[PDB]
């Protein structure tokens, strides 16, 4: 389960539940980057992202 | 489950549930990048993305 | 479970639950970066991200 | 379990539960960075992130 | 369990539970950085992060 | 267990539980930094982080 | 990569590479079994399986 | 990478590489079993498995 | 990396590399079993497994 | 890295490298078993496993 | 790193490296068993395991 | 690092390196067993294990 909200038989109010997270490059199992690396050049660009709510 | 909202028999109010996340490049199992790499050039560009709500 | 909210048979109020986190590059099992590395150049850029709520 | 809120049969009030954390690069098991490294250059940039709630 | 709140059969009040932490680069088991290192240059930049709630 | 709150059959009041901590780079088992190091340069920058609640 | 064999420019011999494993119910990320469970009965049967080479 | 064999420019001999493991129910991140459990009955049966090489 | 063998420019001999392990139920991060448990019955059966090489 | 063998530019001989281990239920971070437990019955059976090489 | 062998530019001989260990239930950080326990019954059985090499 | 062997530019001989250990239930940080316990019954059985090399 990732960010699953389960509500039952309730009386909700305003702004009641908030789950905010930044999980970039998290939760790796056996996942290698440049494991046997020689003479490499890494200049990859990644622009803005995520959630921008106003 | 990813971002599944389940509500039953309730009285909701304004702005009640929010689940915001940035999960870029997360949750890898056995997934390799440049595992046996020699003399490579990485300059891939990725522009803006995500959710922009105003 | 990651950020799962479970409520049952309650009377909620305003701003009641908040779960905020920054989990970037967390929770690694057996995940190597530059394990056997020689003469490499790492200048990857990553822009802004996460959750920006106003 | 990461940031899972479970409430049952209660009367909630305002701002009742808060769980805030900065878990960047935490919780590693057997995860190596630059284990056998020689003559490497690390200048990777990472911009702002996390949770910004106002 | 990380930051899991479990409440049952209660009468909550305002600002009742708070769990704040800074866990950056914590909880390592067998996780090496620059274990056999010679002539390396580490100038990686990491911007602001964490939880900023106002 | 890290920062897990368990309450049952109670009458809560305001500001009742607080658990604040700074656990940066804590709790290491067999985790080495620069174990066999010669002629290295460490100038990695890490910006502000943690929990900022106002 | 799972069980990928890559050989190049070699002189192989008999029984040269063997990779045997039992990975049943391994490598879970955020995957819950009976998370909020009450009064359940689990008697599922699973017969023999795996690799039987003679 | 899980059980990946990479050989290059070599002269192999008999029975040269062996990687045997029993990884059942290993490598869990945020994966809960019977997290909030009450009055459950678990009698699931699982037969023989794995690798049987003769 | 889990059980990854990397050889390059060598002269191998018989029975040269062996990596044997029993990793059952190892390497857990934030993974709970029977966290808030009351009156449960656990009698799950698991048969033989692993690697049996003759 | 778990049980990763890296050899380069060598002359191997017989039975040269051996890495044997029993890592059952090892390496836990924040992983709870029966944390808040009352009146439970644990009689789960697990058969033989591991590596059996003859 | 767990049981990682790194050799470079050498002349190996017979039975040269051995790393044997029994690490069952080792290396725990914040991992609780029966933390708040009352009236529980623990009779879980675990059969033989580990490495058996002949 | 756990049981990591690093050799470079050498002339090895027979039976050269041995690292044998019994690390069962070692290396605990903040890890409690039966912390607040009342009227419990512990009769869990664990069979043979470890490394058996002949």
Residue numbers in the entry:
A (entry chain D), B (entry chain B), C (entry chain F), D (entry chain H), E (entry chain J), F (entry chain L), ...: 2 to 55
What does the paper say about this structure?
The disease arises in mice and humans from the misfolding of the acute phase protein serum amyloid A1 (SAA1). To investigate the molecular basis of the systemic AA amyloidosis, we here use electron cryo-microscopy (cryo-EM) and determined the structures of AA amyloid fibrils from a patient and from a diseased mouse.
The human fibril proteins originate from human hSAA1.1 and mainly represent the fragments hSAA1.1(2–64) and hSAA1.1(2–47). The human fibril protein contains no amyloid key fold. The human fibril exhibits a considerably larger interface containing polar, ionic, and hydrophobic cross-stack interactions. The center of the human fibril is formed by a steric zipper, which shows a self-complementary packing of the sheets β3 from the two protein stacks.
